[PDB]
Each structure stands twice: as C-alpha cells, then as structure tokens.
C-alpha cells in the first residue's frame, strides 16, 4: 500500500548553529508529497533505499528495533546491521551468516555502541560517512503519517565506508511503519531563534517551491519570478562523412625493417582507407608517442584528408629537439616541427635494428648551415662549411667542417648514443573531406527536430532543416553577420541544409501571494508549445493558466500583451490585457465636459536619496590581516588606494545627497504653540514630543515599515536621523508657516489657509474654490491623511522604492560578503586557512588567485555601486528638485509633483530616502455641455479672457477650465477681435455689458 | 541572439503601443491636457489649440482668425515629415543609432566567442575535444575568464547604456507628461 | 551547453546571478520605461466616426 | 556637536504674514563641468609600448 | 583568527561544534576540552582619519 510523505522528513545538514535565518543547501532531501510505502507489524520485506531514506514507525510498545543496510544485503560482502532501544544504539558489520530473513528475538569486521509515538529517522551515506538523524513525537491519526512539520537531529556520524541502495527493518518477535526516498535537491530551512529547524521548502516540488527557493523565502509576494532556462534537449545525434575503400598501411609503415637519415628523411602516405589509430597508439612497437595540443585517444574521433609518415633516425639524447619551441642541430639543419604544431610524433629506441658492429655511420645529420631550415624541409648538399676567416679549401680545420656527421651506432652504445627511430605524423587535417577515418561511420539524417550533429568534423547542436541556400559547387559552409553557422551541405549527398538554432527561454512562475493561494501558472518565454493545461501566446507557451476570452486590466504582466491574475472554482487566469476601458470620448465640434466638483488627493511619492555609506578597507577585505597578502597586493600598484578613493567619493556624495535634498533650509525653523491652521490637521505630520527622536507620527509609521566586520565599515551619516528629522521638521514648519518663501530668501510667515489659496492660483483654479469650500477641503486633506495612516499601517508594501533600495544595498553587501566564501579557483576561500595550510611560493599563487578574484569582486561591487550611486544621485537631484519645486515651490510641470494639478508637498523623512505627500487637485464630477470657439455680438467675435465658453443646452456661460462656476458672459471676462465671418464655428449668443445696467439705471 | 542571448518581447505589443499612442493622441485631440489630470474632458480641436496659444503668450484669437492657414501649415508640415522620412537617412539618426549600438554590442558579444583571450582556441568545444582533464580545464578557465570578463564588459556597458536610455526614457516620460499631456513652458 | 565549464563557472559565485539580475533589472526597466512613457493614460480613448 | 544653522520660532498665526520691502540682486556663480580633456589612449601603444 | 572571545548564551544543540552569523561568518564556538560555549565578537578596528 502507498500514502503521502507530506512536508516532513527534514534534518540538520551541518553541525553549525544559525538562528532566525532561512539557510539553504543542496542535499539528499525527501521530495515533498512523494509516496511513502506503508507496512504493518505482522512484515519486513527487503526494500530499495535509493540515495537515502526517511523511515518512521508508529507504536505504543516499540516493535521496530533495528535495520540492515548495504547495496545488496547479501552477506557475500559485509552488511551493516544496527539496533536501537531508545537508551542506546548498537552497530555491527558482518558476513558470518545468521537467519536468512531476520527478526530480533523477544569477517564481522566492525562493531560500535553508544501507534501513540512516531519514532522518526533519516538514514544516508555520503562520501563514506553514514549518518542517522532522528525525532520522536506523540500522534493522534492512527492510519497515516501526521501533517504538522518537525525536524530530525543526528545520533550517529561514522566514516564506515559501506554505501547503501537497499535496506531491511528488524521486528521484535518471539503498530505500523513507513518509508520515503531522499533525492539530491536544493532545499530551504527555517532556523528559529533557538537554532532549531521549524519549516522547509522543496525547491524541486513545484513552480511555487522553485519561486520560494529563488527568493530564499517561505512567504512569496504576488508576481512573476524567473527560474531556470528551458534549454530544449536535442532528441537525436547525427554523424556524416564521405565513405572510403582501403585499410591503412600501418604494417608497411611500422613493421617493415627499413629506415633513413634525418637530413634526407623518408615519407609514406596514410590515405583512401579506413583506420584504427589505436593500432599505433596502444602498440608495443614504440617507446613514446609525443602529442602536442592533442591526446592520442582523439585520433579515432578525428578524420583526415591525408597523414604523412615523415621518418628518420637520430641518437637517443637528441630526440629532445623534436618539440615546438626547440633549437639545436637536428631542429636547426635537418627536420623541424612548427612552433604552433598540433598533432603527434612516434619515437622508439632502434638499437635493435639500426646499430651495427664497429658502429653504424650510414644514418646521418647536418652539423652546420648559413641559416636554420623551415618546418618539414629537406637539404642534401655536402660541400665544406666555413666559419673561420682562413678558407677551408676542401678539408676540415679550426672553424672549417664537412657539413654532415654520424653517431657510430654500436649495438652496445650508452642510451644517449643509441639510434632512435622517429616518425613525425605530418597531418593533412582540414575542413576538406577526409580520405581516412576511424569507426564513426554515418548515421541517418534528421530534419525539423533539434539534434546534435557532426559533418566532416564541423560539430554542434540545432534544428537541421532543408532550405533554398544554394551553395556554389566548391562552397561547403554558410554563415551570417557574426560568423555563426547558418547552412551546411552533406558530404555523401550534395543537398543543402539550414542549421536553425535550438530552443531556449526563461521558465517563469506566475503566482498570487502565498497567503491568498498556492495555485500557480508557468510561462515559457518565446518557446513553442510543441517542444514543452498548455496554451500558446506571442510571448510563448503558458502552462497551468486558464486562457480567458474576456480582458481584465493588467495584474501580473506575462509578455506581448498577456497578463495573469487569480480569479474564478478560483483559477489563475491569463488574458490579452485590457489597457483599461475603451472610453470613446463623447466628442464633437461643439461638445465640452466641464467638471462641477473636485477632490483633493494626497498621493504619496517615495524617493531614495542616500544609500548606506560604506568604506571597504581594501587591504583588510582582500587580505584578512595577512602579511603575505599585504605584500602581494602591492604588485597591483595603486589599485586598492583607487578603490578606497572610489568608495570614499561615493560616501562623501551620500552626505552631499542628503545635504542637497534636506539642507535646503538655512535655519532650523520650528512650529508654534497654537496650531491655528483653518481646519488642516497637521498634528499627524508635525513633530511628536512623546518619542526619543522628534519624528512626526507619520514619519514614525514610515520609520517602522522600512527595515559588517570583514573590513566592511558602515560609516554614519553626517546628519543623524534626528538631525534629518530636524531638517524635515524645519522644511515642513517653513512649508506650513511660510509657504514657498523660505527657499527664495528668509522664511516669510503666511497663514496656511492663505498659502493654500496661493496653491489654488498655481493650478488656474481661482482661489475662492478653496475658501468657499474651506472646511470640506480641510476634511478631504485630513481624510486623505487618515487614508495615508491607514494605508501605511495596513500596507507595509506601500514603501516599495526605499525598501527596494535598502534590499539592493543589503544584497550588494551580502554578495560582497558571501563572495569571501568563493574560491575563484584558489585552494580555499578563507585566507587565514590558506596561510595555516600553505607557505612561500605555494601560498603566493593561491593568495594571488584570491587577490585576483576578491579584487575583481570588489571592483565589480565598486563599479555597480558607482552606477547605482549615479542612479541614487539622479534620484537625489530629482528629490532636491522636488524639494525646491514641490516643497519650497509649486511646480507647473505636469505630473512632476504627483498626478492631478499639484497644490503642495510635505517632506517626511524615511530611511535612506524621502517621502513627499503631494497634495493635488483632481476634478471628480464631469458633465456634458454645448460649447463654441468664440461668440458673436455686434458682428464682433469675442473670446474668454480666462477659461472656456459653455452652455447647459439652452443658456450661455463662461467658466475656468477645471471647475464649473458658470458666470454670465461679459465684456470683462471676454476680449474682442475682428468680425464673425472668418471664425469657423462661432455661435450667435449676446455678450452682456457691465456698463449697460448702469446706462439703464 | 542565439548563444543564450535571449531577446524578450516588450510587455506592450507594437499594436498595444499603437493603441496607447492612439489613446494619447485621441485624448490630446478630443480633450487636450485634461486627460492627464483626471478623466478625458472633451473639447473641440480648434478650442484645444486655442488653449495652446495662451500657453505661449500668443493671444488665442490669432489661431481662430488664422485657423485655415494654421491647419494647412500643420498639414504641409506633416507632408514634409512624410517626405523627410521618404528620403533622408539623418531624419531618424538616434533610433537607427540605438538599434545599431545594440546590434554592435551583440555582434561584439558573439564575435568575442571567436576571440582567444590567450587560450589555444576560442571555440570551447575545441578544448573539450583535444585536451584531457586539468590542462583542458586551465584553457577553459582562460576562456571563462575572458568570456566572463567580456560578459561583465557587455553588462557593464549595457548598465551604463541603460542609464543613458533611462535618462532618455525619463526625458520621454517627461516630454509625454509636459508636451503631450500638458504644454511645457520650459524653453527649447 | 556543457558540463565541465558550467561547474568551473560556479567558483566565481554571484557574478552570474548578479549579471542575470543586472540584465533582468535592465529588462524590467525597459518595460517600466515604456509603461512610464506611453501608459500615462487610464482608459484607451478613441476618436469619433467624423 | 554641529549646528544645523540657527534655531528659529517662525512668528506664525492665522493672521500673521511677513512681506519683504527690499531685495538684493544676488549674482550667484554656478560652475558646471561640461567637457574634459579628450584623451584617446590607444590601447595598442599603451599596453604594448 | 583574532577577536574578542566571550562566554555566550546561544543554545547550541549537543552535536553542534560552531555557530555563524547571517552572512555565513564564524560568530560563536565550543571549547574542545571543557565544552564552554563562546562568542567571537570581532577584533575592534577602523580608519585613523
Ligand atoms: C505511488 O502510489 C500509487 C498508489 O496510490 C502507486 O500506484 C505508485 O506505483 C506509487 N509510486 C511510487 C514511486 O511509489
Ligand atoms: C539498551 O541496550 C544496552 C546494551 O547495548 C543495554 O545496556 C541497555 O540496558 C538497553 N536498554 C533497555 C531499555 O533495554
Ligand atoms: C573474509 O573476508 C575477506 C575480505 O575482507 C575475504 O578475503 C575472505 O575470503 C573472507 N573469508 C572467507 C572464509 O571467505
Ligand atoms: C527558546 O528557548 C527558551 C528558553 O531558553 C524558551 O522559553 C522558548 O519558548 C524557546 N522558543 C522556541 C520557539 O523554541
Ligand atoms: C557512399 O557514399 C555514396 C554517396 O557519396 C552513396 O551513394 C553510397 O550509398 C555510400 N555507401 C555506403 C555503404 O554508405
Ligand atoms: C494573511 O491572511 C490572514 C487571514 O487568513 C490575515 O490575518 C493576514 O493579515 C494576511 N497577511 C497578508 C500579508 O496577507
Ligand atoms: C509553433 O510550431 C507550430 C508548428 O509545430 C507552428 O504552426 C506555430 O506557428 C508555432 N508557434 C508560433 C507562435 O509561431
Ligand atoms: C471566445 O468566445 C466565442 C463566443 O463568444 C467563441 O466562438 C470562441 O471560440 C471563444 N474562444 C476561446 C479561445 O475561448
Ligand atoms: C454626452 O453626450 C453623448 C451624446 O451622444 C452621449 O453619448 C454620452 O454618453 C454623454 N456623456 C456624458 C458623460 O453624459
Ligand atoms: C459641426 O459638425 C457638424 C457635423 O458633425 C456639421 O453639421 C456642422 O456644420 C459643423 N459646424 C460648422 C461650423 O460647420
């Protein structure tokens, strides 16, 4: 029988205390919700163990008492046996055979000794270390394993060496038990305050668990999260070559008795034939086979147009010259390999063949020349060489010689003076077709499917396809702009193929937030569904979502106009995104809408301003107080002094960023004892005396919602958080009590209800629209401040931009710090460990790999921190401009100081940034009306001085552009110009004259 | 674009971008600046332009009195945009420049797969298919070091370029807000 | 697409994951650039028949 | 411990305003760097001398 | 290493030999002879500005 494993069977990976932290590793872990096989206290079969086992028994009275382990349990090799009685553990290793299907009664090379209750264990062997982890708990469900999480603690850890792939449990005989299998998986572990594992995530369970592990987190927020690339596997593998008739002449080259001199070398051709090069490279006939840029095993994978057996005798000492980069009389004057030679040379002692009694002199070498020979060259002249100024005249002397010599090869010479045979394999290895090849004959040819391929030794992976890419008769490859392969021609059949690239794209997980649901959908970016519920879109294939025929507004953006959300029976829908509702504007040459009432918004905007200052002491970080590294780091010159200069210039510009934003006020202004502000309740945004720092109440919500020693130093800001709050208090006190005047001079006080009426003229809404609504507007501002308190209290996700910047800087440092654990190709990543292991030159190479890596890592950190500091400086120059234009001013720049026509802003300090409460006018009660560009009167055209002409449908009025205050049209809210005939779309009202009621008096 | 260089689509399709430029344009035409500061409040286009004359200190009667002329000047200027685009390479310099720079950066990134960086070949498969064990792995570590240094160079160059394109996208977001959704007083 | 190089590249730590994070941050920022440029509008307004 | 500038009780009330009777035409100097020496270190001649 | 060794309260489980901070650095240790459970506070340091 089978049942569930649930989330259970998790154990401590290593002997390191950690607390309040979400640690992670690859290990053998039990796959969440895998089967467990279920068994009864009646039966103990032999079972698989795979890589590792989660085991448990449920008893009142303990019937399981032990286990037997190994690959086979056969006792032909030693089998491990273990017994446990809760007070003690006993361990035995044996081949001397007991009962053949064992139980516990109510060449043995090693021994050691230390339903109500669920007795849990995890068993594994890794690297020869067999480990037992354990736990015990009461349980209430009799039939199946429990569903509440627990974690397992080590009892045994022994380097026994007996690896395991089967096991059998031991029953007590004169209750139930369960088994599930560990797999090599990445996992996440919730270590609590008391160093105890309290929850886990199986990263390989499902898309949400891949998301949880990507984020190293147990909660996951609503969104789309990238996970691994879907590299579409090749389905098959292709080999193509031309075919050939003979078998290679290796007996006639190497078993034949004859050989020649090195000044006048011999040659024989390998061509037109099948081969097995192991007949050479495994041969007993040779003392050596020197391969340069090659391992000889590869010669049966290669295929050759020809090979030439360039062959000669030299003495056993002088074989050293037959290598790239060498010089000396053989390499100089006889035969030479190229200094870039890729290929092989066969060599053997030939004293058994080429020596003769009295010494053989019939195999010879050139002793002098005017210049060295080229690679593979031959030269056979015998006239007397001269280097002395007195001529040689046909005989030898001081600096005068016959140009050839020979060694006098006796069958009993010392080995350096014995003859050696050499065969240089002068390759003709080419993009040209082979005439020699190994066992790798051709496959079939596969089309419109992604495959591995080889043609003549061009190799790769892709979708082979037939195409119109007609090569000229000599052309054998085709390529695109960047020299990538684009087409090929087959060597047996001269047909044309296009090599279309194989398929890939980032598997990305669409999820609602974990507290709302665990139902999920999976995008495959651009991938075709035929390679992957399943559904196709222009941005790729989409597993698990419900394709919707309707169209909501966007929520989680998928790509190419697709979005997804969790909706109904609930599902993760995916849809073609509505870009909002298709409002056909009720337009005509006489249709206007004029709003009859407003709202005041208080849209919160958040800006980062000053990322956490650091200095990384470049010597202490790179070198860890090493004397050795303190020396080696000098080799790089002023490298550390410029990285420390870069971080210091960043750090000074953070104090500058904060000074440029906040310190725009030349005096610390403060607010009055009496708060007579005409209805606007600032007591929430002004300072609170009831705190150790005088933050406002809203600043204290902001400071609650936003959230070291390795030569890293977090240097303080120049301005303390209380000084930053004294500046935002002075800014805000000026902003309230003096309006914009404190930026452009000395703060000139003005009553806040009158400042708000200035802020109305700056949006073209005449300021009577404030005061004639004053209490209502005060209540809209106060209620919006209420919505802000409620929002910021309920919605910790509101301060996205600052918590993002704090997370970027914390991730940047968690990268720079955890990079100290990276090897970069060093023996170790810990430098005092290197120096307690290693000494002198041996240390200095490894220390220089860590210096290179930590220097490159510190440079990468510093470079991204310089670019990020340029982003934060753009945001701080922007925030200093929102401070000047929105706080110390009122901006006319549309959508600069939040959406709507902006009235004013209040700075609130927040950690590593600023918050602006952009108070803005927004119209809110639209209505239809009839309109005209102008109005005729005494045959004069009239236009409004401010605002627009309007009619309800029967009577004519003028109003400001943004609020319906219908006023009678008059010669002082209008201006004349010219006459009515020119004016396309004029209408035939009468404008009233404010002198007329006085003429008529 | 095919050595793991996956190009990903924009969120908005070119058709959705055209629906937004249409919404922006239909808003602008039928309602003026009002659709940025609320919902679109309709107003006739001749009147939407008479607002724009006041936002440059030209008294708006100058438009309605010269309405047909100004319409023909706008139409003729639109024809000159068509003719400029139907002739001149320097009409669209900045975008063909940006496409070419991204293509040049990608062609550099791909031809850098053909660079040795001091390794015995630039094709990773050549090392894997002629050298065995640690010597192969040292030559591969030269290739990793060079390609990684070139990918760090590409991503660093693309971060500096994304800071430039972002400075241009913040400029275009600002010109959308202030020029389309409003009428900017900011000289030039 | 090879085993030996992929495991040598691990020795360099979060270079690869911060390069993919940098390009992802660039890529999401191109949608953010396009959204902040064009999506300054809540409804797809559309023109009259005349 | 640093000054943030002088502390000041602004003379606030629902009926108090201040207005400046006179000015100063502050010819402020702002210095913006615009270019720099156009180096071109030829990598060939620099790296290999 | 080098630092400020102390006795400590951290609840090491009976098999645990070492303890670490968030970013994977040695932060507490066990005496091998007496099984005392110790902090390792860092060696104090900084710039001489
Ligand atoms: C899991 O259990 C089912 C019965 O529910 C069984 O058919 C299946 O073979 C089991 N698979 C494994 C891997 O245990
Ligand atoms: C457990 O086994 C040990 C011997 O290994 C024995 O000393 C001890 O008394 C046993 N405990 C029980 C409860 O039987
Ligand atoms: C006992 O084990 C050894 C290997 O450890 C083996 O050589 C020997 O043959 C075994 N004894 C018998 C009686 O076979
Ligand atoms: C942690 O240990 C303390 C005693 O040291 C105990 O009071 C507390 O309940 C424990 N908390 C958890 C979550 O284990
Ligand atoms: C050898 O190649 C030719 C085409 O070049 C083909 O006709 C012939 O069938 C091939 N022979 C074998 C045994 O594959
Ligand atoms: C999670 O859901 C619970 C109710 O099931 C609620 O109390 C809690 O506030 C929610 N938290 C979040 C972050 O959604
Ligand atoms: C996916 O492949 C099929 C043929 O297998 C093709 O018809 C379809 O057009 C492809 N998908 C896309 C989005 O083009
Ligand atoms: C969408 O709905 C229409 C009917 O309203 C139907 O004909 C069409 O097949 C549907 N398409 C999908 C993909 O559901
Ligand atoms: C305005 O009038 C038109 C007349 O056709 C109508 O379609 C539209 O719904 C009206 N809109 C409002 C806001 O009254
Ligand atoms: C306004 O447009 C209507 C059709 O929509 C047309 O009948 C009328 O003539 C136009 N107004 C003027 C002044 O031509």
PDB file of C-alpha atoms in Angstrom, chain A residues 293-295 297-298 342 481-482 484 501 504 525 539 557 559-562 576-577 579 585-593 595 856 860 863-864 867 871 893-895 899-901 923 926 928 931-933 943-944 948 961 975 977 982 984, chain B residues 1-4 6 8-13 16 19-20 29-30 33-34 36-45 47 51 54 59-61 64-65 67-68 107 110-111 128-132 152 156 159-160 166 174 177-178 181-182 186:
ATOM      1  CA  UNK A 293      47.791  20.108 -28.496  1.00  0.00           C
ATOM      2  CA  UNK A 294      46.276  16.546 -28.714  1.00  0.00           C
ATOM      3  CA  UNK A 295      45.579  13.422 -26.598  1.00  0.00           C
ATOM      4  CA  UNK A 297      42.653   8.762 -27.784  1.00  0.00           C
ATOM      5  CA  UNK A 298      41.122  11.511 -30.027  1.00  0.00           C
ATOM      6  CA  UNK A 342      49.073  20.465 -33.406  1.00  0.00           C
ATOM      7  CA  UNK A 481      26.639  38.615 -39.992  1.00  0.00           C
ATOM      8  CA  UNK A 482      28.525  37.444 -36.837  1.00  0.00           C
ATOM      9  CA  UNK A 484      27.719  31.928 -36.819  1.00  0.00           C
ATOM     10  CA  UNK A 501      19.177  27.440 -33.687  1.00  0.00           C
ATOM     11  CA  UNK A 504      15.530  28.175 -25.056  1.00  0.00           C
ATOM     12  CA  UNK A 525       9.343  32.896 -22.702  1.00  0.00           C
ATOM     13  CA  UNK A 539       5.355  35.776 -25.717  1.00  0.00           C
ATOM     14  CA  UNK A 557       2.389  41.082 -16.770  1.00  0.00           C
ATOM     15  CA  UNK A 559       4.620  39.500 -22.112  1.00  0.00           C
ATOM     16  CA  UNK A 560       3.450  40.553 -25.634  1.00  0.00           C
ATOM     17  CA  UNK A 561       0.134  41.860 -24.241  1.00  0.00           C
ATOM     18  CA  UNK A 562      -0.642  38.864 -21.967  1.00  0.00           C
ATOM     19  CA  UNK A 576      -4.972  39.637 -23.505  1.00  0.00           C
ATOM     20  CA  UNK A 577      -4.592  42.650 -21.218  1.00  0.00           C
ATOM     21  CA  UNK A 579      -5.086  48.681 -21.437  1.00  0.00           C
ATOM     22  CA  UNK A 585     -14.722  60.284 -25.794  1.00  0.00           C
ATOM     23  CA  UNK A 586     -18.121  61.988 -26.431  1.00  0.00           C
ATOM     24  CA  UNK A 587     -16.505  64.434 -28.895  1.00  0.00           C
ATOM     25  CA  UNK A 588     -17.821  66.893 -31.486  1.00  0.00           C
ATOM     26  CA  UNK A 589     -17.061  70.402 -32.843  1.00  0.00           C
ATOM     27  CA  UNK A 590     -19.464  71.656 -30.081  1.00  0.00           C
ATOM     28  CA  UNK A 591     -19.188  69.086 -27.198  1.00  0.00           C
ATOM     29  CA  UNK A 592     -17.391  70.021 -23.932  1.00  0.00           C
ATOM     30  CA  UNK A 593     -17.174  68.431 -20.472  1.00  0.00           C
ATOM     31  CA  UNK A 595     -16.235  69.290 -14.011  1.00  0.00           C
ATOM     32  CA  UNK A 856      37.668  41.649  -9.350  1.00  0.00           C
ATOM     33  CA  UNK A 860      32.516  44.672  -9.579  1.00  0.00           C
ATOM     34  CA  UNK A 863      31.583  49.554 -10.298  1.00  0.00           C
ATOM     35  CA  UNK A 864      27.932  48.636  -9.682  1.00  0.00           C
ATOM     36  CA  UNK A 867      26.495  53.163 -11.352  1.00  0.00           C
ATOM     37  CA  UNK A 871      21.108  56.342 -10.164  1.00  0.00           C
ATOM     38  CA  UNK A 893       5.434  70.724 -14.695  1.00  0.00           C
ATOM     39  CA  UNK A 894       2.601  68.249 -15.479  1.00  0.00           C
ATOM     40  CA  UNK A 895       2.734  65.020 -13.404  1.00  0.00           C
ATOM     41  CA  UNK A 899      -0.952  63.221 -10.616  1.00  0.00           C
ATOM     42  CA  UNK A 900      -3.569  65.982 -10.869  1.00  0.00           C
ATOM     43  CA  UNK A 901      -2.829  69.703 -10.648  1.00  0.00           C
ATOM     44  CA  UNK A 923     -11.779  67.163 -10.842  1.00  0.00           C
ATOM     45  CA  UNK A 926     -17.860  65.536 -15.107  1.00  0.00           C
ATOM     46  CA  UNK A 928     -21.784  67.131 -20.864  1.00  0.00           C
ATOM     47  CA  UNK A 931     -19.558  74.842 -26.481  1.00  0.00           C
ATOM     48  CA  UNK A 932     -18.148  77.154 -29.168  1.00  0.00           C
ATOM     49  CA  UNK A 933     -14.619  78.519 -30.000  1.00  0.00           C
ATOM     50  CA  UNK A 943     -13.201  85.012 -26.764  1.00  0.00           C
ATOM     51  CA  UNK A 944     -12.985  84.400 -22.938  1.00  0.00           C
ATOM     52  CA  UNK A 948     -13.993  78.347 -21.765  1.00  0.00           C
ATOM     53  CA  UNK A 961     -11.082  75.226 -17.406  1.00  0.00           C
ATOM     54  CA  UNK A 975     -11.860  90.059 -25.299  1.00  0.00           C
ATOM     55  CA  UNK A 977     -11.028  90.567 -32.068  1.00  0.00           C
ATOM     56  CA  UNK A 982     -13.650  84.453 -40.521  1.00  0.00           C
ATOM     57  CA  UNK A 984     -15.037  78.781 -38.204  1.00  0.00           C
TER      58      UNK A 984
ATOM     59  CA  UNK B   1      20.809  36.373 -30.254  1.00  0.00           C
ATOM     60  CA  UNK B   2      21.277  32.523 -30.249  1.00  0.00           C
ATOM     61  CA  UNK B   3      24.226  31.734 -27.881  1.00  0.00           C
ATOM     62  CA  UNK B   4      21.865  32.174 -24.845  1.00  0.00           C
ATOM     63  CA  UNK B   6      17.539  35.588 -25.494  1.00  0.00           C
ATOM     64  CA  UNK B   8      12.490  39.047 -24.720  1.00  0.00           C
ATOM     65  CA  UNK B   9       9.365  40.855 -26.069  1.00  0.00           C
ATOM     66  CA  UNK B  10       8.219  44.224 -24.678  1.00  0.00           C
ATOM     67  CA  UNK B  11       5.231  43.866 -22.304  1.00  0.00           C
ATOM     68  CA  UNK B  12       3.143  46.052 -24.617  1.00  0.00           C
ATOM     69  CA  UNK B  13       2.972  44.672 -28.222  1.00  0.00           C
ATOM     70  CA  UNK B  16      -0.719  47.947 -27.839  1.00  0.00           C
ATOM     71  CA  UNK B  19      -3.378  51.727 -29.053  1.00  0.00           C
ATOM     72  CA  UNK B  20      -1.672  53.820 -26.321  1.00  0.00           C
ATOM     73  CA  UNK B  29      -7.156  65.850 -29.878  1.00  0.00           C
ATOM     74  CA  UNK B  30     -10.591  65.498 -28.299  1.00  0.00           C
ATOM     75  CA  UNK B  33      -4.320  68.292 -21.360  1.00  0.00           C
ATOM     76  CA  UNK B  34      -7.360  67.312 -19.261  1.00  0.00           C
ATOM     77  CA  UNK B  36      -3.636  63.575 -17.695  1.00  0.00           C
ATOM     78  CA  UNK B  37      -5.157  65.481 -14.711  1.00  0.00           C
ATOM     79  CA  UNK B  38      -8.408  63.390 -14.421  1.00  0.00           C
ATOM     80  CA  UNK B  39     -10.582  61.562 -16.963  1.00  0.00           C
ATOM     81  CA  UNK B  40     -10.636  63.000 -20.531  1.00  0.00           C
ATOM     82  CA  UNK B  41     -12.935  66.055 -20.569  1.00  0.00           C
ATOM     83  CA  UNK B  42     -13.898  66.541 -24.239  1.00  0.00           C
ATOM     84  CA  UNK B  43     -13.327  69.901 -26.041  1.00  0.00           C
ATOM     85  CA  UNK B  44     -13.371  70.668 -29.879  1.00  0.00           C
ATOM     86  CA  UNK B  45      -9.893  70.567 -31.534  1.00  0.00           C
ATOM     87  CA  UNK B  47     -10.505  75.083 -28.987  1.00  0.00           C
ATOM     88  CA  UNK B  51      -5.641  76.773 -25.126  1.00  0.00           C
ATOM     89  CA  UNK B  54      -2.346  81.117 -24.383  1.00  0.00           C
ATOM     90  CA  UNK B  59      -3.486  85.696 -27.561  1.00  0.00           C
ATOM     91  CA  UNK B  60      -5.705  82.818 -28.788  1.00  0.00           C
ATOM     92  CA  UNK B  61      -7.759  84.830 -31.346  1.00  0.00           C
ATOM     93  CA  UNK B  64      -9.149  81.075 -34.798  1.00  0.00           C
ATOM     94  CA  UNK B  65      -8.580  84.069 -37.145  1.00  0.00           C
ATOM     95  CA  UNK B  67      -7.410  78.772 -38.481  1.00  0.00           C
ATOM     96  CA  UNK B  68      -7.426  77.512 -42.112  1.00  0.00           C
ATOM     97  CA  UNK B 107      27.795  41.230 -32.620  1.00  0.00           C
ATOM     98  CA  UNK B 110      29.121  36.992 -30.296  1.00  0.00           C
ATOM     99  CA  UNK B 111      32.453  37.659 -32.129  1.00  0.00           C
ATOM    100  CA  UNK B 128      36.872  19.861 -24.740  1.00  0.00           C
ATOM    101  CA  UNK B 129      37.622  17.787 -27.925  1.00  0.00           C
ATOM    102  CA  UNK B 130      41.505  17.768 -27.878  1.00  0.00           C
ATOM    103  CA  UNK B 131      42.696  18.292 -24.232  1.00  0.00           C
ATOM    104  CA  UNK B 132      42.019  15.891 -21.304  1.00  0.00           C
ATOM    105  CA  UNK B 152      30.970  41.673 -17.399  1.00  0.00           C
ATOM    106  CA  UNK B 156      28.633  46.966 -17.543  1.00  0.00           C
ATOM    107  CA  UNK B 159      24.191  49.185 -17.434  1.00  0.00           C
ATOM    108  CA  UNK B 160      25.910  52.441 -18.472  1.00  0.00           C
ATOM    109  CA  UNK B 166      16.745  55.532 -18.863  1.00  0.00           C
ATOM    110  CA  UNK B 174       8.754  63.962 -19.022  1.00  0.00           C
ATOM    111  CA  UNK B 177       3.723  64.473 -19.398  1.00  0.00           C
ATOM    112  CA  UNK B 178       4.747  68.057 -20.197  1.00  0.00           C
ATOM    113  CA  UNK B 181      -0.478  65.737 -21.552  1.00  0.00           C
ATOM    114  CA  UNK B 182       0.298  69.458 -20.944  1.00  0.00           C
ATOM    115  CA  UNK B 186      10.475  75.158 -20.422  1.00  0.00           C
TER     116      UNK B 186
END
